[PDB]
Design a protein around this ligand. Structure first.
Ligand SMILES: CCC1=C(C)/C(=C/C2=NC(=C\c3[nH]c(/C=C4\NC(=O)[C@H](C)[C@H]4CC)c(C)c3CCC(=O)O)/C(CCC(=O)O)=C2C)NC1=O
Ligand SMILES: CCC1=C(C)/C(=C/C2=NC(=C\c3[nH]c(/C=C4\NC(=O)[C@H](C)[C@H]4CC)c(C)c3CCC(=O)O)/C(CCC(=O)O)=C2C)NC1=O
Ligand SMILES: CCC1=C(C)/C(=C/C2=NC(=C\c3[nH]c(/C=C4\NC(=O)[C@H](C)[C@H]4CC)c(C)c3CCC(=O)O)/C(CCC(=O)O)=C2C)NC1=O
Ligand SMILES: CCC1=C(C)/C(=C/C2=NC(=C\c3[nH]c(/C=C4\NC(=O)[C@H](C)[C@H]4CC)c(C)c3CCC(=O)O)/C(CCC(=O)O)=C2C)NC1=O
Ligand SMILES: CCC1=C(C)/C(=C/C2=NC(=C\c3[nH]c(/C=C4\NC(=O)[C@H](C)[C@H]4CC)c(C)c3CCC(=O)O)/C(CCC(=O)O)=C2C)NC1=O
Ligand SMILES: CCC1=C(C)/C(=C/C2=NC(=C\c3[nH]c(/C=C4\NC(=O)[C@H](C)[C@H]4CC)c(C)c3CCC(=O)O)/C(CCC(=O)O)=C2C)NC1=O
Ligand SMILES: CCC1=C(C)/C(=C/C2=NC(=C\c3[nH]c(/C=C4\NC(=O)[C@H](C)[C@H]4CC)c(C)c3CCC(=O)O)/C(CCC(=O)O)=C2C)NC1=O
Ligand SMILES: CCC1=C(C)/C(=C/C2=NC(=C\c3[nH]c(/C=C4\NC(=O)[C@H](C)[C@H]4CC)c(C)c3CCC(=O)O)/C(CCC(=O)O)=C2C)NC1=O
Ligand SMILES: CCC1=C(C)/C(=C/C2=NC(=C\c3[nH]c(/C=C4\NC(=O)[C@H](C)[C@H]4CC)c(C)c3CCC(=O)O)/C(CCC(=O)O)=C2C)NC1=O
Ligand SMILES: CCC1=C(C)/C(=C/C2=NC(=C\c3[nH]c(/C=C4\NC(=O)[C@H](C)[C@H]4CC)c(C)c3CCC(=O)O)/C(CCC(=O)O)=C2C)NC1=O
Ligand SMILES: CCC1=C(C)/C(=C/C2=NC(=C\c3[nH]c(/C=C4\NC(=O)[C@H](C)[C@H]4CC)c(C)c3CCC(=O)O)/C(CCC(=O)O)=C2C)NC1=O
Ligand SMILES: CCC1=C(C)/C(=C/C2=NC(=C\c3[nH]c(/C=C4\NC(=O)[C@H](C)[C@H]4CC)c(C)c3CCC(=O)O)/C(CCC(=O)O)=C2C)NC1=O
Ligand SMILES: CCC1=C(C)/C(=C/C2=NC(=C\c3[nH]c(/C=C4\NC(=O)[C@H](C)[C@H]4CC)c(C)c3CCC(=O)O)/C(CCC(=O)O)=C2C)NC1=O
Lengths: 274, 74, 162, 172, 49, 49, 162, 172, 172, 162
């Protein structure tokens, strides 16, 4: 039932389903009380298209809750290829820029900071780019400017929860997944009492940020490689965070901007207080 | 020119132009060799808002570069 | 979608803050302004048919050559897709009027405009001239603050195309 | 983000149409009641702290387990997080109330929230209750304020309630 | 064939993990009186196949 | 093995299922764990044997 | 300094964009609202003297112990600095009323409030109680939208202190 | 950032005073003329592209050296930068005009600008002229628009001019 | 990233061996046909815009639903996204064609792409078709160009096709 | 300025690395290809002007309304600035030929192109048609790898304008 092979038999579109079952579907044949196996708390099964409506109806009745439906063939092509991003290409802006040296930087900051969503030409931050070109600001300075912009506020903040925002923030600004439940919490409390702007500053003035990017380096991916003071399970979070080269942050998804890192998963790396 | 243009998108209130002798506080080249920064970044003029003035200075000194000047931005 | 209401809410949210007197004053502007906006909207709505045919023709009268064979104002399909496109613009103008902001125009016509027009060999000049004409005729369907509103949004499209 | 007008516009566009005279007048009515709406949003803003505080006092009056060791509003750090969440939800409910649409609430607050709390071990039924108490007090304030012109705000009180009820339902 | 497996009676008793077994020889709630003798014709004894 | 040896006897009506005819894929899925006993059955019932 | 006008301009600038109908609708709110705001401002301005003495006293009546020997409501200098401080609050309330936003309050009283109060052993409770009292009396100096405005800003200060 | 009210407030505060009846009525007058002000800002927004374009055509008509090789508006990259700066300055002038105060213009645009251009080798006198041309055309539009109620806008036309003149002076 | 040589090398290394005389001459042949390969890549680069444009015109000629409201290439924003994706895929196909290996196409473009589109509601069958049209026109250009020396490019036209066909298959 | 030499040096520098056999092999390509490039360059150099007058006229012959009064192909100054502009393009094509890359085109014509053309009401179609014509005639001035080079860069400009 778990992770599948194949798609169809006569022909179908197999969908794999996931639920949470009562002892009504599955119980042991024991002398007392009806219980399902504790590890099949959420169970998944792959069903071809016709049997599918009948299965969902049954599951819902006897008590289960469907958690997901997704085609099997989507889910057979693995996990993302990460070769492009295991070790990236760094882009850095020099002291006397060359006229297109600076062109390189802007295109990359865009891609990285905005998480590969398209920024259309009406959309670009032109006045701010003027500034970088003249040297009035530096690459880190410019990077902070994009984050406080409406375009950044609008595709990533306004329409999703704070859990999601912060998780995106780590990906964009720091290039790495969020290590702890404390990190999520520490941030949510800051936004709540100092506002959005103070909270944005907190990733860009951090010691972690400063070491790796310094000030003239565009933030680049770095979570597919071992880092310091990183729990070990933050390397699996990175797969959940980045879905491949053609994937992007996208707020235009049918289901909306949502999570990607399970809250349960974060707790595995440690729980304390505050 | 780092001759600040406008308010340099800092918004806020007053603008202070602060110059520091930064070491590799910032700007270590991504290169394999020894955490240097370009030679012409010995003094780093930078314009910050009054609200962000104190935090920045604290992390400049904390990372070792020393402030060399300070003037109100205008 | 940019409206006075969404803008003030966005600005509050991003500072983690309840709406305050600054933001509610702003909203009152949008609500006080609705009457003029919505009068413009109703007039543009019922005249749509003729506003569109008027502007379509004016594109051919100002660019005579478009209607010769081998050209992009020739044959049923080009001339059909043109009427449609001006109709899209008037539609979003009415939406922007009703919505209290440029959002509908920004999201459905401005975002991507040039890339599309450039791939399809569509000159902005036509569209500006369609809109200049629509602006001429809307001078006598409306007046006062409804006209100012209609104008605001027509001009907004013309600047988007220059 | 949507407001009540923007919602109309999206549905019209999906038909390929200028707004129906039906939809036009529904929106004319929203403009008609907008002063009342501003007072209603103002009622919440002007008493936000007390609304949260009073909801809180009462939540822990009922559920004295949350403030024992082992409980999800113990020690100070957790209580501050719980007080903060009460504020966040009251905030997005007020935004929805200015907007005439629940979307900002659903998209930037409620989406994923239940699964967050379950991951954390935060008892969702207690959070739902804290939201029910905020509703009682918030509406209290919407209905009985400082020298507002006398009239009928029940339509708006209902709509505010559904935003509180959305949040509760979404979380429990 | 689907109907037997996918039915209330089969599912209620054999769950998703038990394997099907002879229950004809014991009173099951709701069976008709003739379930018992009829089952004997069907069953030939352990060698019987 | 218990489930697999058992199932066959129970559903094939105790007819000798010889080594040359096992349904090779019914069991494979059941071992790799994708399917239940209940869908293991539904896959033997529609088999040629 | 946060006003409806500065907010919409900030939002335009940050997208490199001319002010459009969304932003001008917002501004109209702020301008339409000025009359009520400025009536509140004039009433709070001329009653300032007594509003301040009323609230100062109420801090001592609600916290009786403050006025003995060894306490922070004792001696000319404490009681003088108190009147002054409430006067600062009323002053910025009138400014926020006149300005069309919380800016004056945010920049001159809210930014830094807790750090200062904590270093100087000043309890917010006093200040909340000063403001609660000012709110009681302003109930009969104003009514309608001027009262709502006065309230908006008084309440804003009370939330800043909780 | 300041607007005309905020400016009043800052000066009052430096006295330790509630606003003078003097200052109150100066601000009452600004509210009195605010519809005209909105039309004036709208005049610029509604013709921004043409104002820049027309200023531009005329700047290079006069100074044909800028579009020769060796010239600061050659090749396409530099012309686009020059067109962009014309827009930026027109933009901050319109902001000042909505605000009734020059500060946003001086603080976000004019501060350091001259020294930038000198560092770049951009001829400041030509930039000053481009600003003078934008002024001529912008005011043209403020004075002769689409079906605005007839009245006297000279006070506002002056004030707009001083913002154009500030920029010119600051840059040349 | 792999090219056709790099691929050989990886397979050799997995044997622990210096390249086989078999593999050597396969690669000698790739060098033999490399001028033709450069012309083939150049054919695509030199007509990229028209290849995308012509594919596009034809895609929407066939599928007039995409350009109706409700359709995935409506309004301008979505059409621009669709036009861009056409360019992105044509770009990685040209890279594969210079390389003599599909890997850059599969790893940087095709990996995850189908699941992206399904999440977005983008009709994959329409995207597959747009890719089939790009193929027709691209190969058209590879086969009939400006004053290239006459010879046989069918081997390269096939290989280009398989890159177009990989993309189509991967997406549909 | 993009050439094979600058590209390999850029790639070395950015990895903090001496030039190695990979990078020197690349450079040899650029040097081996100089002969064909520079033959194209000399032929394009000596047979030059008439290409401009030919293309300028063709813009008016294909867009007749162009050479009529009130239009942008009328009067000495428009027609003068046109010849100049095509001459700029041919000039940068020769530079790109000589330089071993698109740098001169990227830096002096492509960067900013659309913004400029859009502000000045210059249609890319003219320029594409100027270049399509130049491409037709260069078919008989060159052949073999010099023609391929000329073509590469002419086509590069046409794609920049679409
Ligand atoms: C593999 C062997 C195996 C284990 C271990 C097992 C655990 C298990 N415990 C369950 C429920 C349960 N388990 C408990 C246990 C407790 N409640 C408390 O408050 C106490 C802290 C604790 C007793 C010490 C309760 C109350 C439920 C029912 C939960 C509910 O339905 O609300 C269920 C859900 C199915 C059912 O209710 O029968 C499973 C699968 N099932 C298994 O097959
Ligand atoms: C705060 C708002 C703001 C302003 C005002 C601003 C000005 C400004 N203009 C610049 C360049 C420029 N500005 C121009 C302008 C002109 N050239 C001429 O010959 C004319 C006289 C004039 C047009 C009227 C040109 C040509 C350059 C490019 C100079 C170069 O790189 O060689 C630069 C260098 C960065 C860049 O090129 O993007 C800045 C910072 N930047 C800003 O962020
Ligand atoms: C999008 C807006 C938004 C919401 C709604 C939000 C909820 C949220 N609540 C959290 C924690 C929390 N929430 C509570 C709330 C409660 N505890 C109780 O016992 C009560 C039932 C309830 C108060 C009524 C507590 C105690 C925690 C801390 C859990 C822990 O760390 O152990 C966290 C983890 C991060 C953190 O602790 O800061 C998130 C993301 N975050 C957001 O950004
Ligand atoms: C753009 C390319 C580039 C250059 C050229 C460069 C030079 C450079 N050399 C430096 C230090 C240094 N350079 C030397 C070099 C010498 N000491 C001697 O006695 C000899 C005379 C000489 C060797 C021949 C030493 C000893 C230091 C360290 C000084 C110190 O920290 O005390 C530093 C300070 C940052 C650091 O220590 O990493 C820079 C920026 N940095 C660059 O990024
Ligand atoms: C490295 C450790 C460190 C120090 C020492 C530091 C000092 C420092 N004090 C500042 C401001 C300040 N400092 C004071 C201090 C005083 N005002 C008075 O009248 C008194 C005489 C005096 C208190 C005894 C005031 C009032 C300001 C704000 C000035 C303003 O914004 O107008 C600022 C500007 C940034 C900000 O306001 O946060 C810095 C950087 N910053 C640091 O990071
Ligand atoms: C939601 C907002 C929206 C807009 C504004 C829009 C414009 C638009 N116009 C198009 C085509 C077109 N547009 C025209 C326009 C005209 N032809 C004439 O006779 C006149 C000269 C002119 C009208 C003034 C023509 C002829 C085409 C067909 C182009 C082609 O496919 O060759 C297309 C290509 C898809 C298609 O063929 O329909 C788009 C996307 N699409 C949108 O979704
Ligand atoms: C600063 C932002 C802003 C606010 C807050 C605002 C309020 C406002 N509320 C009003 C009316 C009112 N407001 C209410 C509200 C209520 N009636 C009740 O009995 C309930 C307790 C309460 C329910 C919410 C009623 C009944 C009216 C009179 C009817 C109407 O005008 O719709 C009016 C019309 C003038 C008047 O009759 O006083 C204004 C201007 N205007 C603004 O620009
Ligand atoms: C359709 C409803 C229905 C009925 C009526 C029913 C009767 C029934 N009674 C049975 C056994 C039995 N019935 C009895 C009953 C008795 N023993 C005595 O001495 C008394 C005279 C009498 C009680 C009054 C006993 C002792 C057995 C077990 C016989 C054995 O296994 O040795 C069995 C064999 C299966 C089993 O043991 O569960 C059936 C099917 N089953 C059904 O499904
Ligand atoms: C409970 C344990 C058990 C036994 C004992 C058993 C016997 C048994 N033997 C069978 C067939 C058979 N048995 C034989 C045996 C023989 N043929 C000869 O000529 C010899 C005399 C003899 C071997 C010594 C043959 C040939 C068949 C196949 C008959 C046919 O299909 O034509 C069948 C029919 C099902 C099948 O073919 O698999 C059963 C049920 N089944 C069981 O489950
Ligand atoms: C959407 C934002 C917004 C705008 C733009 C707005 C404009 C606006 N301009 C007005 C008046 C006016 N506007 C002008 C403006 C001019 N008179 C001239 O002759 C000059 C050409 C021009 C100089 C700027 C004049 C003279 C009046 C009438 C007098 C007055 O009301 O002050 C009025 C009062 C109603 C009327 O008399 O028409 C409004 C509402 N209101 C708004 O809410
Ligand atoms: C690695 C290289 C790469 C690829 C291939 C890529 C694909 C890609 N296409 C996207 C959207 C899109 N793609 C299309 C494409 C189409 N619409 C149609 O109807 C047609 C069938 C088709 C054009 C042929 C559309 C319309 C969207 C926008 C969907 C939306 O936001 O609603 C998005 C979401 C982010 C965004 O909108 O910018 C990604 C990541 N992104 C990448 O980085
Ligand atoms: C700047 C990068 C670069 C390119 C583009 C390049 C092209 C190039 N193509 C060549 C040959 C050729 N190219 C083709 C190509 C074709 N024949 C056809 O009929 C088809 C339409 C087309 C299929 C792709 C053929 C057939 C030859 C002659 C045979 C050969 O040399 O392999 C030659 C050998 C000289 C010659 O015969 O002209 C060169 C140098 N060299 C380079 O350095
Ligand atoms: C270094 C590379 C470079 C290019 C390519 C360039 C293009 C360019 N063409 C321009 C104008 C122009 N371009 C033309 C073009 C034409 N008129 C016609 O008769 C034909 C239709 C067409 C030729 C095909 C016209 C008429 C103008 C004058 C536009 C105006 O000022 O109104 C201008 C405006 C400044 C000026 O008036 O000279 C630029 C910058 N400038 C550069 O620096």
């Amino acid at each position: 039932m778990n992770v599948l092979t194949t798609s169809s038999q006569r022909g179908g579109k197999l969908f794999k389903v996931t639920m949470t079952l009562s002892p009504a579907l599955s119980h042991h044949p024991w002398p007392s009380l009806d219980t399902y196996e504790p590890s099949q708390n959420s169970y998944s099964v792959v069903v071809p298209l016709d049997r599918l409506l009948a299965e969902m109806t049954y599951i819902k009745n006897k008590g289960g809750r469907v958690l997901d439906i997704s085609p099997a063939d989507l889910e057979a092509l693995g996990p993302p290829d990460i070769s492009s991003v295991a070790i990236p290409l760094k882009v850095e802006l020099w002291a006397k820029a060359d006229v297109s040296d600076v062109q390189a930087a802007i295109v990359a900051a865009y891609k990285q900071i905005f998480g590969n969503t398209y920024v259309l030409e009406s959309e670009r931050l032109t006045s701010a780019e003027s500034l970088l070109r003249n040297g009035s600001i530096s690459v880190r300075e410019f990077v902070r400017l994009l984050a406080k912009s409406e375009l950044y506020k609008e595709r990533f903040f306004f329409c999703t929860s704070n859990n999601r925002f912060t998780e995106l923030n780590f990906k964009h600004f720091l290039g790495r997944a969020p290590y702890n439940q404390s990190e999520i919490a520490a941030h949510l409390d800051r936004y709540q009492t100092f506002g959005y702007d103070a909270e944005i500053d907190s990733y860009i003035d951090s010691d972690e940020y400063i070491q790796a990017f310094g000030e003239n380096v565009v933030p680049y991916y770095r979570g597919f490689k071992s880092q310091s003071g990183q729990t070990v399970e933050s390397f699996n979070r990175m797969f959940k965070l980045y879905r491949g080269d053609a994937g992007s942050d996208t707020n235009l998804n049918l289901q909306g901007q949502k999570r990607r890192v399970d809250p349960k998963n974060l707790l595995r790396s440690g729980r304390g207080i505050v | 020119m780092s001759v600040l243009t406008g308010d340099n998108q800092q918004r806020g209130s007053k603008l202070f132009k602060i110059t520091i002798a930064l070491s590799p506080t910032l700007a270590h080249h991504p290169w394999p060799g020894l955490d240097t920064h370009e030679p012409s970044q010995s003094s780093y003029s930078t314009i910050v808002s009054l609200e962000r003035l104190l935090p920045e200075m604290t992390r400049i000194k904390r990372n070792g570069g020393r402030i060399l000047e300070i003037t109100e931005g205008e | 979608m940019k409206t006075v209401i969404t803008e003030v809410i966005a600005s509050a949210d991003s500072q983690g803050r309840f709406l305050n007197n600054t933001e509610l004053q702003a909203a009152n502007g949008r609500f006080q302004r609705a009457t003029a906006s919505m009068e413009a909207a109703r007039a543009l709505t019922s005249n749509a048919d003729s506003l569109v045919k008027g502007a379509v023709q004016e594109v051919y009268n100002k660019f005579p050559y478009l209607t010769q064979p081998g050209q992009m104002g020739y044959g049923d399909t080009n001339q059909a897709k043109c009427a449609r496109d001006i109709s899209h613009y008037l539609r979003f103008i009415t939406y922007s009027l009703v919505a209290g902001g440029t959002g509908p125009l920004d999201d459905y016509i401005v975002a991507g405009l040039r890339e599309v027009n450039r791939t399809f060999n569509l000159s902005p000049s036509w569209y500006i001239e369609a809109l200049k004409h629509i602006k001429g005729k809307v001078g006598s369907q409306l007046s006062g603050q409804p006209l100012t509103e209609a104008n605001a949004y027509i001009d907004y499209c013309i600047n988007a195309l220059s | 983000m949507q407001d009540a007008f923007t919602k109309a516009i999206v549905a019209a566009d999906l038909r390929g149409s200028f707004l129906s005279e039906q939809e036009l007048n529904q929106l004319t009515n929203l403009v008609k009641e907008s002063n009342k709406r501003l007072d209603a949003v103002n009622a919440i803003t002007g008493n936000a702290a007390e609304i949260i505080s009073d909801a809180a006092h009462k939540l822990f009056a009922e559920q004295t387990d949350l403030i024992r060791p082992g409980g999800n509003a113990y020690p100070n750090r957790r209580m501050a997080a719980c007080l903060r969440d009460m504020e966040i939800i009251l905030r997005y409910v007020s935004y929805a109330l200015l907007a005439g649409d629940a979307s900002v609430l659903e998209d930037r607050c409620l989406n994923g929230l239940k699964e967050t709390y379950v991951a954390l071990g935060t008892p969702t039924r207690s959070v739902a209750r804290a939201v029910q108490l905020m509703k009682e007090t918030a509406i209290g304030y919407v209905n009985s304020p400082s020298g507002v012109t006398r009239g009928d705000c029940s339509a708006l009180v209902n709509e505010a309630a559904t935003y509180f009820d959305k949040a509760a339902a979404s979380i429990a | 064939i689907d109907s037997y497996i996918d039915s209330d009676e089969y599912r209620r008793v054999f769950g998703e993990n038990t394997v099907p077994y002879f229950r004809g020889f014991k009173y099951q709630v709701g069976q008709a009186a003739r379930g018992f003798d009829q089952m004997q014709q069907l069953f030939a004894g352990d060698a019987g196949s | 093995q218990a489930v697999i040896r058992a199932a066959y006897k129970q559903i094939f009506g105790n007819t000798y299922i010889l080594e040359a005819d096992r349904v090779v894929i019914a069991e494979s899925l059941l071992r790799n764990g994708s399917i239940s006993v209940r869908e293991f059955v539904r896959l033997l019932a529609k088999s040629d044997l």
